[PDB]
């Protein structure tokens, strides 16, 4: 048999159903989703790091003047300073007064820290989504399997076919431009190759970690070596990595909505609790059992013994059952009004057992099916007196949950009063319209 | 090796959480809702402060 459903893309909440293929006992299905791995296809655009400016040795040609070519180097400068009198230890280093050459070659290249740290910039695409799922059916124990989230992939979890249809919403935390740094990512636009703004982010732009081309753009300028001391004084803007670290934004993982955590080595956002998932699970037929074998259960009476609409299962109730023979039953409420803690109850004759449940409505009306039977029970729940707790919401709230059955009475009597007053008017207009107009005649 | 700021003194009121913080060193506190709107909040705390 095939069972299809839909499920909250929630991370700790189990999803409980009963498959019902007729003529067999209902069989209890549990799906638990333990991570949500949304894997975006990415391409590394360029990497970046602190620059380092290598100033090769200057050329000091004494009398006369050399000229220097534009050798291909990132952000290369070479300027000849005429009128130099470089004055070293043990003599000045040149025999001319003026008309001497100080060539002042400067050149900028990737620092060695780039090997260990680098804010590599990607370009995010739609990619694929997958998840690790945990199933429990019948008396078979827990069976876990990773699964591609797309309808077109069998993903055989054990002995059953699980097809997980494409995620209801296509939201992704990542925009098209992302930059990964260390253990985190940033939803930052990056001035891409060769558009480097000369001082904020893209001072260096290296196509890969070990690339021979480097689009330095750092606004290197060279100055006159003062007072005849040999050196190549170079003035230029500080590193873009400096200012990007200082004025770094909040990391995406600290801003990503829907409780989305981020991991790195696939650049994946986990535990991303958006929308819902369709499910289509084709269970083995062998796990079923003929209804004629199944016990009859009858004269069911369930009473809520104490409930309080807490997140955790803060309602206890009791069901008095009478039985045909020893055996197992699944108990789940077919409707979202309650979630039942207990998967299965394996049951003797003529007895009264207790089940825990969680709910937020202030008069729950669960219709709970024990062993292909039915029983409906309701009662008051009270506010569970803690304010903030750390257990996520086991139940799903619906709008018609908070109305306290006097407020329900109050709005009912109010709406009835308006409607009946207008109806009284309508009847009065009709009866005067006829008794007084047409009967006098 | 990094430092651990003293664990915040935490106490609850109705739908609000109130952290008394006593940073010995300047400390970064980030908060983010897990709903549709992240509503991030990121501030550095130098002196002992309370925050709601
Ligand atoms: C499946 O759920 C059970 C519930 O106790 C848990 O012990 C088990 O670790 C889960 N599977 C995986 C792969 O974590
Ligand atoms: C909320 O913050 C304000 C401003 O700092 C403060 O006056 C107030 O005491 C805080 N809340 C509580 C419950 O104290």
Q: Would you report the helix, strand and coil content of chain B in percent, each value rounded to 5?
A: 0, 45, 55
Measure A10 CA to nearest chain B CA, in Å.
12
Q: Would you report the helix, strand and coil content of chain A in percent, each value rounded to 5?
A: 10, 35, 55
Resolution in Å, one decimal, please.
Answer: 3.6
Which is nearest to A377 in space by CA: A309, A319, A312, A438? A319
Contact call for residues A94 and A62 (beta carbons, < 8 A): yes
Q: Which positions in chain B touch A256 (Cβ < 8 Å)? A: 32, 38
Angle at A436 between CA A433 and CA A441, to 5 degrees: 105
Determination technique used? cryo-EM
Task: Tell me if residue A123 falls in helix, strand or coil.
Answer: strand
Q: How far apart are CA A329 and CA A291, in angstroms?
A: 12
Q: Name residue, tokens 């990497």.
A: A47
Domain range enclosing B14: 2-52
Contact call for residues A117 and A49 (beta carbons, < 8 A): yes
Q: For A201, left (φ over 0), alpha (ψ -120 to 50), or beta?
A: alpha
Closest ligand 1 atom, CA of A142? 1
Q: What is the DSSP letter of A342?
A: -
Please count the CA atoms within 13 angstroms of the CA of A121 that sit on its side-chain side.
19
Q: How far apart are CA A313 and CA A355, in angstroms?
A: 10
Q: Which residue of B lies nearest to A275 if distances are taken between CA atoms?
A: B36
Nearest CA to ligand 2 atom 11: B52
Which is nearest to A326 in space by CA: A367, A306, A297, A352? A297
- DSSP readout, A45-105? EEB---EEEE-PPPEEEEES-------S-TT-B--EEES-----SSS-S-SSSS-EEEE--
Q: What is the CATH number of the domain that holds B46?
A: 2.60.40.2400
- How does strand A59-63 pair with strand A315-323? unpaired
Choose, out of A245, A258, A392, A397, the residue to mutate when testing the contact with B (most B CBs < 10 Å). A258
Task: Count the domains in chain B.
Answer: 1
For A357, other C-beta atoms within 10 Å of its C-beta total 25
Task: Tell me if residue B39 falls in helix, strand or coil.
Answer: coil
Q: How far apart are CA A266 and CA A55, in angstroms?
A: 39
- As for chain A, the residues directly before each break of C–N over 2.5 Å are none
The encoded tokens of residue A330 equal: 């699944």
Q: What is the DSSP letter of A291?
A: T
Which is nearest to A15 in space by CA: A40, A34, A2? A34
Q: What are the phi and psi torsion angles at A354 (to 5°)? A: -115, 135
Q: How far apart are CA A338 and CA A360, in angstroms?
A: 8
């Amino acid at each position: 048999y095939e069972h299809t459903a839909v499920m909250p893309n929630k991370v700790g909440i189990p999803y409980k159903a009963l498959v019902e293929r007729p003529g067999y006992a209902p069989v209890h299905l549990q799906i638990q989703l333990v991570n949500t791995r949304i894997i975006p296809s990415t391409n590394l655009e360029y990497i970046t790091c602190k620059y380092k400016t290598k100033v090769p040795s200057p050329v000091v040609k004494c009398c006369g003047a050399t000229q220097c070519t534009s050798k291909p180097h990132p952000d290369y400068q070479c300027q000849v300073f005429s009128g130099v009198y470089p004055f070293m230890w043990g003599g000045a280093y040149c025999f001319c007064d003026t008309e001497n050459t100080q060539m002042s070659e400067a050149y900028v290249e990737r620092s060695e820290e780039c090997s260990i740290d680098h804010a590599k910039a990607y370009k995010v695409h739609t990619g694929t989504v997958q998840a690790m799922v945990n199933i429990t059916y019948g008396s078979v124990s827990w069976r876990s399997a990773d699964v591609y989230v797309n309808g077109e992939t069998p993903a055989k979890i054990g002995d059953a076919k699980l097809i997980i249809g494409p995620l209801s919403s296509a939201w992704s935390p990542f925009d098209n431009k992302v930059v990964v740094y260390g253990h985190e990512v940033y939803n930052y636009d990056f001035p891409e190759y060769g558009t480097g703004k000369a001082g904020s982010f893209g001072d260096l732009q290296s196509r890969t970690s070990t690339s021979n081309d480097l689009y330095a753009n750092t606004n290197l300028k060279l100055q006159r070596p003062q007072a005849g001391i040999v050196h190549t004084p170079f003035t230029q803007v500080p590193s873009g990595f400096e200012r990007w670290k200082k004025d770094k934004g909040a990391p995406l993982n600290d801003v990503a909505p829907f409780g989305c955590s981020i991991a790195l080595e696939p650049l994946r956002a986990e535990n991303c609790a958006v929308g819902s998932i369709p499910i289509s699970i084709d269970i083995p037929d062998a796990a079923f059992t003929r209804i004629s074998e199944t016990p009859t259960v009858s004269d069911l009476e369930c009473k809520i013994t104490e409930c309080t609409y807490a997140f955790d299962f803060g309602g206890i109730a009791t069901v008095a059952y009478k039985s045909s023979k020893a055996g197992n039953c699944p108990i789940h409420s077919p409707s979202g009004v309650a979630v039942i803690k207990e998967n299965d109850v394996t049951l003797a004759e003529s007895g009264s057992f207790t089940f825990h449940f969680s709910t937020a409505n202030i008069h729950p009306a669960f219709k709970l099916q024990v062993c292909t039977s039915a029983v409906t029970c309701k009662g008051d729940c009270k506010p569970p007196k803690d304010h903030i707790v750390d257990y996520p919401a086991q139940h799903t709230e619906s709008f018609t949950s908070a109305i306290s059955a006097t407020a329900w009475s109050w709005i009912k009597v109010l709406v009835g009063g308006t409607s009946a007053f207008i109806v009284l008017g309508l009847i009065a207009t009709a009866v005067v319209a006829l008794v007084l107009f047409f009967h006098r005649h | 090796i990094a430092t651990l700021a003293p664990e915040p003194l935490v106490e609850h009121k109705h739908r609000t959480l109130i952290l008394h913080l006593h940073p010995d060193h300047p400390t970064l506190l980030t908060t983010r809702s897990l709903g549709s709107d992240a509503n991030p909040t990121r501030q550095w705390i130098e002196r002992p402060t309370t925050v709601n």
